[PDB]
RNA sequence: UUCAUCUAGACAGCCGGACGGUGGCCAUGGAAGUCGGAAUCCGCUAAGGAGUGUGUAACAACUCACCGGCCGAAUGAACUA
RNA sequence: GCAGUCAAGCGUUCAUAGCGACAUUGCUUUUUGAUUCUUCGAUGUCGGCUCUUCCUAUCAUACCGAAGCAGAAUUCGGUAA
């Protein structure tokens, strides 16, 4: 009846395998799955079945979505 | 019980005339002495201690010319309440303390018969 | 107040500015006194420093024994010709200002006073009260 | 009061209560105050601050040595 | 550098409830409950566990980081408050005017009033903080005994005593008087 | 390393950390004894007075005794089969509880067994154990022993000493024209007390030594037998 | 003198200067040079007595 | 700065008021002769000099003010081998107008046999040579001179063939006897200074 | 005082009464001239910091 | 950046040891590592200064430097921008 | 100020080729508060009466801190116009 109880913000994580949605550049709209983590503000994504070229990206260029 | 001093060379004004006689044998060295209450009269006794045998075995200072015969004998009188395995370390705290005071032994510092000893040149009976 | 002032002392008219001679009261020898300074005045720029009856100032004899000439001791005001108020309403004033000598701590050096002394001068110094033969 | 009236105090009375304490607290303090000193006393008191420091410093250097 | 995620662990004990929703913490326990509010430290909870909870800072600089341990500490302190409980223990200790210390009701509340402080007519009045409980030990000669559920509270009012019968214009080398500290412990001692 | 970081305080003293070579003598010293002599006990010493450990240590000459750290006389001894140095010898690495010594010695394992068995001296009641006694500190002035020798028989206990007793003691103690007091007597411990740390620098502090130390002699490794007899005389 | 002893040596915390440097010779010559002493001045303040009375003038604390 | 703090700690020894020193072995134990006979605070317990300077205190006796002054007490060498400690207490002696109380402990306790005591008396004489001397023996309720030794009667008998020297008995525990002392040694003091200013 | 001494001021040592006096000559005297000025303006000057 | 230390246990903490000749010599009211002047060695050691400071009238006690027990993995120093 | 000294550092290639912070030493009227009670070319005309404001580098008053600061007084320092 009496536990803690911790309101945890539930952030989305960059994670290997999270996919993020490129908002800007020649890959606008397109999703695209985190592969490796570089530093705190660059990672390696991934969307090959849309059409995106593995590259090196800032975190600011994609908007991670809730899909992992 | 036991109540010990070095201030020679509980009743004061009767010890004071009493442990006279233990010391001056000493002639005004100063020296380690004790007393053994049993209600409320002591004995004297003089307890032996390196730096006092050393003075005896010659304000003031001390150069000494000791000979190594008078050093092992006061190391010998300190054996039973020392740490060492062998006369050849009491002596060499007998040395040390020698050094200390300022006297020199067998006619030179006595700090060269710690390696004296160290290096075999100097011998001790055991 | 003062050095061997009795209490507090309340305003009454100054009379006497610095450089006014008034009449030695007491019997110490003193014809009159020559006021050169003003104990416990404030500092107002052109304001010269002025005493009233109670006040302690500095005085030298001007006139009189040679004992006591060319010397600075202090005094304290016992009349005054400037008419001031006394609370139960009346405005008083003497026929001529004096005062006597006192030492610092306010013994009198003299050991009478003679004339009138003001009753805020008496009640104010108890050396000056114990030495005047008229109060008033 | 006549001979050394402040020792005699401190033996017949002690000290205060929380002297110790304050004492060593300020003393753990000083390591805070000596930057806050160097990083905001101005002007000459600044320039003084600094040089004292500087030789202060070579001092302790010197001893070491 | 930055730390990728630096964390710390605020070990709740078996009685204790710690509520946390936008960084404002309920402790509640055995003794009575406490509320701090923690919004202007950028700091993120975590229920572990019911046993534990785990405080983090993303992303953060040598500033930053500094405030992690002492987020956790706070917690545990008023933790401590809420199991154990904090007792403040001063003694007021004179050379020749006795200390009289008593608790009066001045307007609804609750006051120490420190009298004869050296001798001074002025009555100091120092207020009891809420939830400080101030007794008077009987066992020992003057003595007060201050204890809460919060520390900073107990501490504070203490202090306030300590500093209200501060020595003014005295070499306090002679003049040892005033109110003091001795002991700062726990309520219970021993569990 | 960035700013803002504790000063280290360093003092003017004469003597210089030892360094690893010192751990290395302590190894090959090992070594060599372990070769020569026959009998090494393992002896725990956990919180022993240096004069005690010297008396023991020369109350045998034909024999060593070694101390160190833990760890490099379990290296010296060997970890395990594979890094050990004699045969089946592993067995006393395993068997270094603490504050260890080793006892090489060629004395008949009788006469040592016994020799530890019967050793004894007083020591202080140090903390975390049972407390052999219970004292009251009395009330009134407090001499050096607390009572211990009669108040006539003691002298006052110094007044410099006192703010050790009422911070650190936790003793509420007052000065009385220049003397520790205290109002009230104050029991320190009873008997059968797991002591704190405060209890036994208390006890300490009044020369309480109604305690007693014995060497706790664990396993010891017969050298050409080339076995551990697990003798255990706590 | 500086040079012998310093101001250290002297007085102080580091204080050596323990006996007087030029201790009499017995106790009674000491006394009789005290009694000179204590004649000379008093004989001084008689005799300085006679130039005042300036310090009387100070108990009427006149200038 | 050393001096000026020091300097201005030191008592306010007036050479010429009714002064009267307190010579010899006065404090002993818990007692002491001027914490008994004035208000003053010094410090007792038997080592050889646990006050390294003068103490003064003050009383009244039939209407005027005397200062009584503690020494710190000297020993019998020569005066070449006196240090600045004891100077303090010849000093004293020599110097001011007094009249000297020389105290011994006839008990065990000050560490002093009885002829060490009279021996230092008979070295400390000729300051004497002066003043009005008093020899006041302490400790009498913890000692019998009943069973004093007739060679210790014999040189407290030889103490008083010095001019002006009147022993006494005392004991410190007993406030009558403390205050008795002191004023026979007041009226001896004020004898004195009456045959000088009726002179 | 002829009895007691206890009224002596108190003496500073040597670099911290160096600093006590230096340091009131650079506070109660004024501390701005300019080169341009009269002559004796800057001599004024500094006669008066001496 | 350079150098140094580190599972032969690093840094920080508690806890323990911190000894024996020995209260070394001289000095003096006292001076025992700690008011001072010069020596500053030996033994026993895991380590422990003829003592880093608080302390005592002297001692006592505490302390560090130095070892050791617990813990467990990085840390310290000087410099440069 | 001049002339030295030492050397944290610098140069570097050679640390003796040289620089060089801090620290320090010699010079200035006699070691016992006596004198040294002692004056020596301003090529300058600015200065007072009234009256206002600003500066802080604070003399006082306010509050603090450090001192042998017992008290009283004082000294040094901080905030402060």
């Given at each position: 009846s009496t536990d803690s109880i911790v309101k945890a913000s539930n952030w989305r994580l960059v994670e290997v395998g999270r996919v993020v949605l490129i908002k800007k550049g020649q890959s606008a709209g397109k999703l695209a799955a985190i592969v490796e983590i570089i530093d705190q503000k660059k990672v390696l994504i991934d969307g090959p079945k849309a059409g995106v070229p593995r590259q090196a990206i800032n975190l600011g260029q994609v908007v991670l979505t809730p899909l992992t | 019980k036991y109540l010990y001093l070095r201030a020679v060379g509980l009743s004061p004004k009767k010890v004071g005339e009493d442990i006279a006689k233990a010391t001056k044998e000493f002639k005004g060295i100063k020296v380690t002495v004790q007393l053994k209450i049993q209600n409320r009269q002591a004995a004297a006794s003089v307890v032996p201690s390196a730096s006092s045998l050393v003075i005896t075995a010659l304000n003031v200072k001390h150069s000494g010319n000791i000979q190594l015969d008078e050093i092992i004998e006061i190391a010998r009188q300190m054996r039973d309440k020392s740490f060492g395995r062998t006369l050849a370390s009491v002596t060499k705290e007998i040395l040390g303390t020698a050094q200390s005071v300022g006297c020199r032994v067998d006619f030179k510092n006595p700090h060269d018969i710690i390696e004296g000893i160290n290096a075999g040149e100097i011998e001790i009976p055991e | 107040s003062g050095n061997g002032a009795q209490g507090t002392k309340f305003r009454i008219s100054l009379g006497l500015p610095v450089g006014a001679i008034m009449n030695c009261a007491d019997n110490s020898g003193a014809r009159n006194l020559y006021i050169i300074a003003v104990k416990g005045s404030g500092s107002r720029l052109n304001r010269l420093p002025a005493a009233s009856l109670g006040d302690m100032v500095m005085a030298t004899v001007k006139k009189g024994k040679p004992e006591l000439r060319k010397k600075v001791m202090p005094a304290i005001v016992v009349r005054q010709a400037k008419s001031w108020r006394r609370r139960d309403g009346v405005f008083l004033y003497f026929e001529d200002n004096a005062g006597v000598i006192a030492n610092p701590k306010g013994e009198m050096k003299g050991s009478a006073i003679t004339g009138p002394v003001g009753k805020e001068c008496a009640d104010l110094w108890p050396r000056v009260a114990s030495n005047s033969g008229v109060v008033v | 009061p006549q001979n050394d009236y402040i020792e005699r105090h401190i033996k017949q009375h002690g000290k205060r209560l929380d002297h110790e304490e304050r004492k060593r607290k300020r003393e753990a303090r000083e390591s805070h105050k000596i930057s806050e000193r160097a990083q905001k006393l101005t002007g000459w008191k600044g320039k003084q601050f600094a040089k004292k420091r500087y030789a202060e410093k070579v001092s302790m250097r010197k001893k070491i040595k | 550098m930055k730390y990728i995620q630096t964390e710390q662990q605020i070990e709740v004990p078996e009685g204790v409830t710690v509520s946390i929703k936008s960084r404002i913490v309920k402790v509640v326990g055995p003794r009575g409950t406490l509320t701090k509010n923690l919004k202007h430290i950028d700091v993120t909870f975590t229920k572990v566990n019911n046993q534990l909870i785990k405080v983090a800072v993303h992303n953060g600089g040598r500033k930053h980081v500094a405030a992690l341990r002492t987020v956790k500490s706070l917690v545990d302190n008023m933790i401590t408050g809420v199991t154990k409980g904090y007792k403040y223990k001063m003694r007021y200790v004179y050379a020749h005017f006795p200390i009289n210390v008593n608790i009066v009701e001045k307007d609804g509340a609750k006051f120490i009033e420190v009298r004869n402080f050296l001798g001074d007519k002025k009555i100091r009045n120092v207020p009891v903080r809420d939830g400080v409980t101030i007794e008077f030990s009987t066992?020992?000669?003057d003595e007060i005994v201050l204890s809460g559920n919060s520390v900073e509270d107990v501490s504070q009012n203490a202090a306030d005593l300590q500093q209200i019968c501060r020595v003014r214009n005295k070499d306090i080398r002679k003049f040892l008087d005033g109110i003091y500290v001795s002991h700062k412990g726990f309520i219970t001692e021993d569990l | 390393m960035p700013r803002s970081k504790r000063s280290k305080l360093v003092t003017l003293a004469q003597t210089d950390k030892k360094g690893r070579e010192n751990k290395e003598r302590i190894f090959d010293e090992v070594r060599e004894a372990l070769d020569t002599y026959r009998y090494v006990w393992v002896l725990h010493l956990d919180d022993v007075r240096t004069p005690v450990l010297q008396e023991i240590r020369t109350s045998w000459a034909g024999s060593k005794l070694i101390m160190g750290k833990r760890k490099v006389l379990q290296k010296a001894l060997g970890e395990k089969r594979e890094e050990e140095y004699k045969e089946n010898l592993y067995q006393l690495s395993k068997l270094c509880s603490g504050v260890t010594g080793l006892l090489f010695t060629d004395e008949d394992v009788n006469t040592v067994k016994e020799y530890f068995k019967s050793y004894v001296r007083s020591d202080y009641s140090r903390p975390n154990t049972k407390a052999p006694l219970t004292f009251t500190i009395p009330?009134?002035?407090?001499y050096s022993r607390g009572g211990q020798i009669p108040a006539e028989e003691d002298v006052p206990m110094i007044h410099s000493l006192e703010p050790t007793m009422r911070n650190k003691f936790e003793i509420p103690t007052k000065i009385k024209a220049g003397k520790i007091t205290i109002d009230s007597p104050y029991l320190?411990?009873?008997?059968?007390e797991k002591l704190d740390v405060r209890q036994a620098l208390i006890l300490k502090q009044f020369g309480i030594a109604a305690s007693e130390f014995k060497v706790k002699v664990s396993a010891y490794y017969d050298n050409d037998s080339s076995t551990v007899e697990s003798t255990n005389i706590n | 003198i500086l040079d012998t002893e310093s101001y250290a040596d002297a007085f102080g915390p580091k204080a050596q200067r323990k006996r007087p440097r030029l201790a009499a010779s017995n106790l009674e010559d000491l006394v009789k040079a005290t009694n000179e002493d204590i004649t000379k001045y008093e004989e001084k303040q008689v005799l300085d007595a006679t130039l005042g009375g300036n310090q009387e003038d100070k108990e009427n604390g006149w200038t | 700065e050393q001096v000026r703090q020091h300097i201005g700690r030191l008592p306010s020894i007036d050479?010429?008021?009714r002064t009267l020193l307190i010579c010899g072995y006065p404090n002993v134990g818990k007692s002491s002769f001027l914490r008994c006979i004035t208000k003053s605070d010094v410090d007792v317990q038997?080592?050889?000099?646990?006050?390294?300077s003068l103490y003064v205190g003050h009383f009244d006796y039939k209407y005027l003010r005397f200062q009584a002054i503690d020494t710190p007490g000297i020993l019998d060498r020569p005066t070449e081998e006196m240090n600045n400690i004891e100077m303090q207490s010849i000093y004293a002696i020599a110097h001011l107008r007094s009249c000297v109380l020389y105290f011994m402990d006839?008990?065990?306790?000050?560490?002093?046999?009885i002829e060490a005591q009279v021996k230092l008396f008979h070295s400390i004489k000729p300051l004497f040579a002066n003043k009005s001397v008093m020899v006041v023996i302490n400790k009498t309720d913890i000692i019998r001179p009943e069973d004093l030794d007739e060679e210790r009667a014999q040189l407290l008998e030889s103490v008083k063939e010095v001019p002006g020297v009147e022993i006494m008995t005392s004991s410190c525990q007993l406030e009558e006897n403390v205050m008795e002392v002191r004023n026979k040694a007041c009226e001896k003091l004020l004898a004195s200074r009456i045959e000088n200013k009726l002179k | 005082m002829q009895l007691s001494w206890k009224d002596i001021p108190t003496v500073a040592p040597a670099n911290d009464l160096l600093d006590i006096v230096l340091n009131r000559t650079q506070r109660k005297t004024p501390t701005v001239i300019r080169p341009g000025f009269k002559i004796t303006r800057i001599r004024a000057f500094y006669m008066r910091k001496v």
């Open positions: - | - | - | - | 066992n020992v000669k | 009330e009134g002035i407090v320190v411990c009873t008997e059968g | - | 050479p010429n008021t038997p080592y050889a000099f646990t006050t390294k006839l008990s065990e306790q000050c560490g002093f046999t | -």
